[PDB]
Scaffold this motif. Structure first.
Motif, PDB file in Angstrom:
ATOM      1  N   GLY A 199       0.652  -1.063   0.122  1.00  0.00           N
ATOM      2  CA  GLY A 199       0.067   0.143  -0.469  1.00  0.00           C
ATOM      3  C   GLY A 199       0.893   1.262   0.099  1.00  0.00           C
ATOM      4  N   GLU A 200       0.060   2.454   0.299  1.00  0.00           N
ATOM      5  CA  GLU A 200       0.734   3.899  -0.174  1.00  0.00           C
ATOM      6  C   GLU A 200       1.428   4.348   1.424  1.00  0.00           C
ATOM      7  OE1 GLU A 200       0.936   5.309  -3.154  1.00  0.00           O
ATOM      8  OE2 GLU A 200       0.663   3.731  -3.378  1.00  0.00           O
ATOM      9  N   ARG A 201       0.635   3.707   2.320  1.00  0.00           N
ATOM     10  CA  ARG A 201       0.826   3.749   3.729  1.00  0.00           C
ATOM     11  C   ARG A 201       1.787   3.121   4.760  1.00  0.00           C
ATOM     12  NH1 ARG A 201      -3.794   6.969   7.954  1.00  0.00           N
ATOM     13  NH2 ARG A 201      -2.457   6.630   9.337  1.00  0.00           N
ATOM     14  N   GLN A 202       2.268   2.146   4.177  1.00  0.00           N
ATOM     15  CA  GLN A 202       3.543   0.987   5.141  1.00  0.00           C
ATOM     16  C   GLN A 202       4.151   2.192   6.131  1.00  0.00           C
ATOM     17  OE1 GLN A 202       2.328  -2.597   4.887  1.00  0.00           O
ATOM     18  NE2 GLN A 202       0.743  -1.009   5.112  1.00  0.00           N
ATOM     19  N   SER A 203       4.757   0.619   6.938  1.00  0.00           N
ATOM     20  CA  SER A 203       5.893   1.521   7.712  1.00  0.00           C
ATOM     21  C   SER A 203       6.464  -0.137   8.311  1.00  0.00           C
ATOM     22  CB  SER A 203       5.036   1.524   9.456  1.00  0.00           C
ATOM     23  OG  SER A 203       4.436   2.710   9.461  1.00  0.00           O
ATOM     24  N   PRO A 204       7.671  -0.160   8.781  1.00  0.00           N
ATOM     25  CA  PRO A 204       8.419   1.228   8.996  1.00  0.00           C
ATOM     26  C   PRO A 204       9.094   1.543   7.750  1.00  0.00           C
ATOM     27  CG  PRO A 204       9.756  -0.876   9.039  1.00  0.00           C
ATOM     28  CD  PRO A 204       8.285  -1.485   8.943  1.00  0.00           C
ATOM     29  N   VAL A 205       9.833   2.514   8.142  1.00  0.00           N
ATOM     30  CA  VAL A 205      10.615   3.325   6.580  1.00  0.00           C
ATOM     31  C   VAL A 205      11.494   3.599   7.587  1.00  0.00           C
ATOM     32  CG1 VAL A 205       8.221   4.276   6.205  1.00  0.00           C
ATOM     33  CG2 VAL A 205       9.323   5.938   7.800  1.00  0.00           C
ATOM     34  N   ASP A 206      12.589   4.381   6.119  1.00  0.00           N
ATOM     35  CA  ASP A 206      13.698   5.101   6.699  1.00  0.00           C
ATOM     36  C   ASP A 206      13.719   6.015   6.792  1.00  0.00           C
ATOM     37  OD1 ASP A 206      16.589   5.142   6.567  1.00  0.00           O
ATOM     38  OD2 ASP A 206      16.535   6.628   5.087  1.00  0.00           O
ATOM     39  N   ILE A 207      13.638   7.072   7.988  1.00  0.00           N
ATOM     40  CA  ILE A 207      13.436   7.697   8.350  1.00  0.00           C
ATOM     41  C   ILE A 207      14.998   9.137   7.639  1.00  0.00           C
ATOM     42  CG2 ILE A 207      13.417   9.875   9.932  1.00  0.00           C
ATOM     43  CD1 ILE A 207      12.597   7.748  11.148  1.00  0.00           C
ATOM     44  N   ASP A 208      14.681   9.687   6.789  1.00  0.00           N
ATOM     45  CA  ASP A 208      16.461  10.385   6.076  1.00  0.00           C
ATOM     46  C   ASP A 208      16.483  12.113   6.840  1.00  0.00           C
ATOM     47  OD1 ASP A 208      17.625  12.502   4.638  1.00  0.00           O
ATOM     48  OD2 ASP A 208      17.473  11.740   3.007  1.00  0.00           O
ATOM     49  N   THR A 209      16.756  11.778   7.383  1.00  0.00           N
ATOM     50  CA  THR A 209      17.404  12.661   8.299  1.00  0.00           C
ATOM     51  C   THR A 209      17.625  14.278   7.618  1.00  0.00           C
ATOM     52  OG1 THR A 209      19.364  13.486   9.253  1.00  0.00           O
ATOM     53  CG2 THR A 209      17.795  11.583  10.688  1.00  0.00           C
ATOM     54  N   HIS A 210      17.900  14.687   6.747  1.00  0.00           N
ATOM     55  CA  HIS A 210      17.974  15.872   6.049  1.00  0.00           C
ATOM     56  C   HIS A 210      16.901  16.275   5.562  1.00  0.00           C
ATOM     57  CE1 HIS A 210      22.093  14.566   7.333  1.00  0.00           C
ATOM     58  NE2 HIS A 210      22.095  15.691   6.738  1.00  0.00           N
ATOM     59  N   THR A 211      15.849  15.728   5.078  1.00  0.00           N
ATOM     60  CA  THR A 211      14.729  15.793   4.396  1.00  0.00           C
ATOM     61  C   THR A 211      13.246  15.574   5.108  1.00  0.00           C
ATOM     62  OG1 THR A 211      15.398  13.680   2.550  1.00  0.00           O
ATOM     63  CG2 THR A 211      13.166  14.638   2.456  1.00  0.00           C
ATOM     64  N   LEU A 263      14.760 -19.437  18.179  1.00  0.00           N
ATOM     65  CA  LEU A 263      15.150 -18.877  18.980  1.00  0.00           C
ATOM     66  C   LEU A 263      14.577 -17.482  18.093  1.00  0.00           C
ATOM     67  CD1 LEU A 263      19.176 -18.845  19.785  1.00  0.00           C
ATOM     68  CD2 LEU A 263      16.886 -19.305  21.312  1.00  0.00           C
ATOM     69  N   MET A 264      13.467 -16.169  19.005  1.00  0.00           N
ATOM     70  CA  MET A 264      12.704 -16.184  18.684  1.00  0.00           C
ATOM     71  C   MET A 264      14.228 -13.784  18.451  1.00  0.00           C
ATOM     72  SD  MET A 264       9.743 -13.603  20.576  1.00  0.00           S
ATOM     73  CE  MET A 264       7.970 -14.673  20.009  1.00  0.00           C
ATOM     74  N   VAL A 265      14.023 -14.062  17.310  1.00  0.00           N
ATOM     75  CA  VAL A 265      15.604 -13.193  16.794  1.00  0.00           C
ATOM     76  C   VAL A 265      15.042 -12.791  15.790  1.00  0.00           C
ATOM     77  CG1 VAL A 265      17.244 -13.858  18.508  1.00  0.00           C
ATOM     78  CG2 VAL A 265      16.954 -14.208  16.096  1.00  0.00           C
ATOM     79  N   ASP A 266      15.223 -11.349  14.816  1.00  0.00           N
ATOM     80  CA  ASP A 266      14.348 -10.185  14.274  1.00  0.00           C
ATOM     81  C   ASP A 266      13.366 -11.164  13.508  1.00  0.00           C
ATOM     82  OD1 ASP A 266      17.598 -10.344  13.199  1.00  0.00           O
ATOM     83  OD2 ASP A 266      18.527 -11.962  12.729  1.00  0.00           O
ATOM     84  N   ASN A 267      13.120 -10.440  14.122  1.00  0.00           N
ATOM     85  CA  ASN A 267      11.160 -10.226  14.427  1.00  0.00           C
ATOM     86  C   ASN A 267      10.925  -9.140  13.535  1.00  0.00           C
ATOM     87  OD1 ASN A 267      11.749  -9.575  16.967  1.00  0.00           O
ATOM     88  ND2 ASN A 267      10.504 -10.267  18.045  1.00  0.00           N
ATOM     89  N   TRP A 268      11.857  -8.248  12.867  1.00  0.00           N
ATOM     90  CA  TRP A 268      11.427  -6.782  12.475  1.00  0.00           C
ATOM     91  C   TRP A 268      10.733  -6.959  10.990  1.00  0.00           C
ATOM     92  CZ3 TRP A 268      15.366  -5.750   9.161  1.00  0.00           C
ATOM     93  CH2 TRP A 268      16.303  -6.141   9.126  1.00  0.00           C
ATOM     94  N   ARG A 269      10.295  -5.837  10.378  1.00  0.00           N
ATOM     95  CA  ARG A 269       9.598  -5.777   9.286  1.00  0.00           C
ATOM     96  C   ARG A 269      10.578  -4.757   8.219  1.00  0.00           C
ATOM     97  NH1 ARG A 269       4.234  -2.911   6.119  1.00  0.00           N
ATOM     98  NH2 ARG A 269       4.637  -4.629   4.785  1.00  0.00           N
ATOM     99  N   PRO A 270      11.611  -4.788   7.390  1.00  0.00           N
ATOM    100  CA  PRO A 270      12.427  -3.822   6.483  1.00  0.00           C
ATOM    101  C   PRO A 270      11.486  -2.985   6.512  1.00  0.00           C
ATOM    102  CG  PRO A 270      11.950  -5.326   5.525  1.00  0.00           C
ATOM    103  CD  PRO A 270      10.663  -6.151   6.737  1.00  0.00           C
ATOM    104  N   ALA A 271      11.742  -1.582   6.201  1.00  0.00           N
ATOM    105  CA  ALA A 271      11.966  -0.324   5.877  1.00  0.00           C
ATOM    106  C   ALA A 271      11.295  -0.499   4.576  1.00  0.00           C
ATOM    107  CB  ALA A 271      12.987   0.502   5.150  1.00  0.00           C
ATOM    108  N   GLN A 272       9.637   0.164   4.354  1.00  0.00           N
ATOM    109  CA  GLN A 272       9.407   0.279   3.621  1.00  0.00           C
ATOM    110  C   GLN A 272       9.541   1.561   2.799  1.00  0.00           C
ATOM    111  OE1 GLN A 272       7.895  -2.966   2.556  1.00  0.00           O
ATOM    112  NE2 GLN A 272       8.654  -3.796   4.460  1.00  0.00           N
ATOM    113  N   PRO A 273       8.238   1.928   1.533  1.00  0.00           N
ATOM    114  CA  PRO A 273       8.515   3.021   0.228  1.00  0.00           C
ATOM    115  C   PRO A 273       7.801   3.669   1.127  1.00  0.00           C
ATOM    116  CG  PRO A 273       8.609   1.046  -0.575  1.00  0.00           C
ATOM    117  CD  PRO A 273       7.897  -0.025   0.599  1.00  0.00           C
ATOM    118  N   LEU A 274       8.517   4.890   0.801  1.00  0.00           N
ATOM    119  CA  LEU A 274       7.924   5.721   2.007  1.00  0.00           C
ATOM    120  C   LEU A 274       6.613   6.560   1.012  1.00  0.00           C
ATOM    121  CD1 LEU A 274       7.866   8.277   3.927  1.00  0.00           C
ATOM    122  CD2 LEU A 274       9.454   9.066   2.773  1.00  0.00           C
TER     123      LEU A 274
END
Ligand SMILES: C=CCN1CCC[C@@H]1CNC(=O)c1cc(S(N)(=O)=O)cc(OC)c1OC
Ligand SMILES: [Zn+2]
Length: 258
Positions: free
Chosen positions: A23-35, A237-248
Motif C-alpha cells: 500500500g501507499e502508507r506502510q511502516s516502517p520507513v527509513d527516516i532521512d534526517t536531511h529530508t 530462537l525469537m530473533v530478527d522479528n522486524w519488518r524492513p523499511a517500506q517505500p515512503l
C-alpha cells in the motif's frame, strides 16, 4: 502456514494474505534526517504515564507484549501531531540476532539493536478494535534501543522473560511503570503509516523518538533467549522479528525539533 519472520512466511510473503502490504502508507520507513522538515505547527507532545496499570506479559509467538488496563484514561498520549486522547494498550519490542540490526525504523539507513513500540488508540472510537480501522485510530510511540549501559527500567521485563519462553505463555506483570523505558528527550519524527505486522492496517500515526535508550548487552541477550515455537516443539530462537523499511511513497516525515 501462518505469518511470521522466516524465509517461508516472512515479510516478503505477507502481501499474499494482506495485500495492503504493498500500500501507499506502510511502516516502517527509513527516516532521512536531511529530508525531514521541522514543523512549527506541531503542538507539545504529552506522554502521561503516571497512572499506568500494567496487567500481564505474553509471548504471542512474534514478540512479547505487556498489556495495560485501558478501560479508562490512565496512561495516555496527546499533543504533537495528535488530536484528542490516545490510551496506552500495550508495548512490545522488535530485535535482532546481532546488535547491528533489530529496529524496524532506520535513521539515515542506520539500524538499531531493537525498537520499543508503545501502542495507543484514539478514545473517540470507544474501543481499540474500532480504532484500529480508522485512519487516525492508532498512535505508536517508537523508541530505539542501542547496546551500551543498562536501562534500569527495563530490568523487571528482562527478569520475567524466563517465565514466558514459548509461544502462548503469559505471566502476571502488575505495577510495571513504562516511564522507566523513556529517554530524556521527547524530540521526535512523525509520519502517517501502518501496523508493521499483519493485518498491516494503514491506521497509525507514528511518533519515533530521536534519542535512543541504552540497554546492556546482557539485557538484549535475554530477549534473544525467547522462542517463536510453543512448549515441546523444536526450538527456534525469537530473533530478527522486524519488518524492513517500506517505500515512503507520497509521505512527508515531520520533525518536532530544529
Ligand atoms: C486489537 C488489535 C490492535 N492492537 C492495537 C494495534 C496493534 C494491536 C494488534 N496487534 C498486535 O498486538 C501487534 C502489533 C504489532 S505492531 N509492530 O505495533 O504492528 C506487533 C506485534 O507483534 C510483533 C503485534 O502482535 C503480533
Ligand atoms: Zn511493533
Amino acid at each position: 502456514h501462518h505469518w511470521g519472520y522466516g524465509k517461508h512466511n516472512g515479510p516478503e510473503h505477507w502481501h499474499k494474505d494482506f495485500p495492503i502490504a504493498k500500500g501507499e502508507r506502510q511502516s516502517p520507513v527509513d527516516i532521512d534526517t536531511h529530508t525531514a522538515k521541522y514543523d512549527p505547527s506541531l503542538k507539545p507532545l504529552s506522554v502521561s504515564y503516571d497512572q499506568a496499570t500494567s496487567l500481564r506479559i505474553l509471548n504471542n509467538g512474534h514478540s512479547f507484549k505487556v498489556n495495560f488496563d485501558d478501560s479508562q484514561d490512565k496512561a495516555v498520549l496527546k499533543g504533537g501531531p495528535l488530536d484528542g486522547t490516545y490510551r496506552l494498550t500495550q508495548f512490545h519490542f522488535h530485535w535482532g540476532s546481532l546488535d547491528g540490526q533489530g529496529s524496524e525504523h532506520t535513521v539515515d539507513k542506520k539500524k538499531y539493536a531493537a525498537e520499543l513500540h508503545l501502542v495507543h488508540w484514539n478514545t473517540k472510537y470507544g474501543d481499540a478494535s474500532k480504532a484500529s480501522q480508522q485512519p487516525d485510530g492508532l498512535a505508536v510511540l517508537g523508541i530505539f534501543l542501542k547496546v551500551g549501559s543498562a536501562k534500569p527500567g527495563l530490568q523487571k521485563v528482562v527478569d520475567v522473560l524466563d517465565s514466558i519462553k514459548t509461544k502462548g505463555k503469559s505471566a502476571d506483570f502488575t505495577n510495571f511503570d513504562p516511564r522507566g523505558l523513556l529517554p530524556e528527550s521527547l524530540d521526535y519524527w512523525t509520519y502517517p503509516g501502518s501496523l508493521t505486522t499483519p493485518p498491516l492496517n494503514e491506521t497509525v500515526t507514528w511518533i519515533v523518538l530521536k534519542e535512543p535508550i541504552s540497554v546492556s548487552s546482557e539485557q538484549v541477550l535475554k530477549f534473544r533467549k525467547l522462542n517463536f515455537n510453543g512448549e515441546g516443539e523444536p526450538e527456534e530462537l525469537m530473533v530478527d522479528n522486524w519488518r524492513p523499511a517500506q517505500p515512503l511513497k507520497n509521505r512527508q516525515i515531520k520533525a518536532s525539533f530544529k
